[PDB]
Amino acid sequence: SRYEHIPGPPGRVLQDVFLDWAKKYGPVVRVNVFHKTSVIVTSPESVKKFLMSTKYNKDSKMYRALQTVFGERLFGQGLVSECNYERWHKQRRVIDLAFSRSSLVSLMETFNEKAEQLVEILEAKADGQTPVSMQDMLTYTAMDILAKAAFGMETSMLLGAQKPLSQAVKLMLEGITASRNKRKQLREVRESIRFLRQVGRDWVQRRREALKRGEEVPADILTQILKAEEGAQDDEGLLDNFVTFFIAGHETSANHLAFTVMELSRQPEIVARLQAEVDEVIGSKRYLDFEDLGRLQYLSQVLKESLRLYPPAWGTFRLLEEETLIDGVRVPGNTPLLFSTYVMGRMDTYFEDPLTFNPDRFGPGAPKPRFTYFPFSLGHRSCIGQQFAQMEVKVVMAKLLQRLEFRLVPGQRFGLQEQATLKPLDPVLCTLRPRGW
Ligand code: HEM
Ligand SMILES: O=C(c1cnc2c(-c3cnco3)cc(C(F)(F)F)cn12)N1CCOCC1
Incomplete structure (x- = not known):
């Protein structure tokens, strides 16, 4: 009843329902999300006010499913899910x-090697007939x-190794989904979470043992994760961040890649332009240098436009502590405010012809979204x-564009699913040919 006065209702996702409601009911709308009443705020004035200030912090109640799932600590109080400002x-x-x-410049070698490995695996299947799940790959x-x-660990998933670890990730992601919106599922989800954390402990022990023997350990994310816990009473904070980075550091990137490949499969003209750009910038070099990345301007634009229509992470929550007027609407104190780049990206008030994929929205001369x-x-x-x-x-995309042509298998859909992140509904099944075919 405390929210009843707020405007709102009496391969398609909940974010789409939110989009419809924002279009119908305006910039401040009451919704139900993750068992709680929230208010979706979609004016740029509000985005600026609430996100650009340390006065407003994350609403912990909306991050519970990251912290713990079915009584198993997951991301705990790691970097994404920690909602206390000082902590x-x-x-x-x-x-x-x-x-x-x-730090990031030093990672170019890793980016190049793994991208090269992927491309070689795909090239061997480029017979224009064998279906390849680009989402999986x-x-x-x-x-x-x-x-x-991040960890100096070789998972070798491209070689088909670590299938248990792969399974653990998938079940855990399903656990997050189920938590926020029976017996065997509980069992599998719980064991998967403990497995991921145990991977953490195992790799942390290896690191500490390497350091003790004075073996060479290149400074990485794990170095700083360790550093953050210097005088902790236990390793639970360390494992929180291990799992946080293990998941956050690949899932959304993968989603973004999958969406981009999926979309480009129906954009032949854009693909031709991207191919030409890669040809001119990097040529027949196997390796991209750091300075090549900035020169791939049109690719930067395509990737930005991909994120506008297909953000893997649709947004964020801030806790409104005191009653506040937001765009002419009285919003009570102690309310989760929902911000969605997904919703605003598809609103014609913010983007002309919002469903049109147009990299030129991000061109040098174009007004930047505010x-x-x-x-x-x-x-x-x-x-x-x-x-x-x-x-x-950019490394992965440039290497694909350099070497391969992709056709989406007929029947494959362009829809989304919402499953902890946004990702393609379908496996992005493609056939492949070498470039110049
Ligand atoms: C295209 C890929 C990616 C997208 C779209 C993405 C998106 C986002 C978004 C929207 C947030 C804010 C989440 C919130 O408010 O609850 C976030 C935070 C975060 N992301 Fe990413 N992310 C990506 C890649 C990565 C990678 C590669 C890493 C790690 C290597 C990472 C680690 C994190 C962490 C740790 C946070 C929390 C930061 C903080 O609160 O201080 N993400 N990301
Ligand atoms: O769960 C999240 C969230 C926010 N960011 C992420 C990321 C992420 C960020 N950068 C890379 O990965 C990964 C995931 C995971 F693990 F489920 F895939 C979840 N999140 N929430 C914020 C949105 O509102 C609801 C709660």
Whole structure:
């Protein structure tokens, strides 16, 4: 009853229902999400006010399903799910060091090697007949990149290794989904969560043992994760961040890659342009250097446009502590505010012809979206891995475009599913040919 005065109702996802309601009912709408009444706020003035201020913090109630699933600690109080500002701030500042320009430059070798491995595997299947799940292949690639870059671990999923680990990730993601919106499922979800955390403990022990023997350990994300816990009473905080980075550091990247490949399969003219760009910039070099990345301007634009229509992470929540007028609507104190880049990206008020895929929206001369586009969020709680993700996906995409042509198998759909993140409904089944065929 405390919300009844707020405007709202009396391969398709809940975010689409939210979009319809925002269009119908305006910039402040009451909805039900993850068992709780929330208010979806979709004006750019509100996006700016709430995300660009340390006064507003995340609503912990909306992150519970990350923290713990079916009584098994998952991300716990790691970097995504920690909602107390001072606790968040301490760990952010320490982990930031691993995402410095110089840090990320050093990761180019890893990005290149895994992308090259993927392309060689795909080239061997490029007979224009064999169906290849690009979602699967891109997920394996993203996992292999993350594991190596962040932890110095070789998962070798591209070689078909670590099937248990692969299963654990999938069931855990299903657990998150079920938590927020029987006996065998509970059992499998719980065991998968404990497995992921045990992977953490095992790899942490290996790291500590390497350090003790004075073996060479290149500074990475894990270094800073360890550093953040220097004087902790237990390793539970460390394992929180292990699992946080293990999952967050590949899932969304994989989703973004899958969406991009899927969309480009029906954009032959754009693909031709991307191919030409890659041809001119990198030529027949096997390896992309860091300075090549900035030169792939048209690819940057396509990837931005991909994130506008297909953000893997649709948005974020802030807790409104005191009653506030938002765009002419009285919103009670202690209310989760829902921000959605998915919704605003598809609103004609913010983007002309919103369903049209147009990389030119992000062209040099074009007016930049002002608080209407935030696939990595905005403000202090924006994605720590934003530049990491942008680099790795550009490396992977450039290498695909250099070497291969992709056709979506007829019957494959362009719809989304909502399953902890947004991802293609279908496996993005494609046939492949070498370029110049
Ligand atoms: C295209 C790929 C990616 C997208 C679209 C994405 C999107 C986002 C979004 C929307 C948030 C804010 C979440 C919230 O408010 O609850 C976020 C935060 C975060 N992302 Fe990402 N992300 C991506 C890749 C990565 C990568 C590669 C890493 C790690 C290597 C990563 C780690 C994180 C972490 C740790 C946070 C929490 C940061 C903080 O609160 O201080 N993400 N990301
Ligand atoms: O669960 C989230 C969330 C926000 N960010 C992420 C990321 C992520 C960010 N960067 C890379 O990965 C991954 C996942 C995971 F593990 F489910 F796939 C969940 N999240 N929430 C915020 C939205 O509102 C509801 C609760």
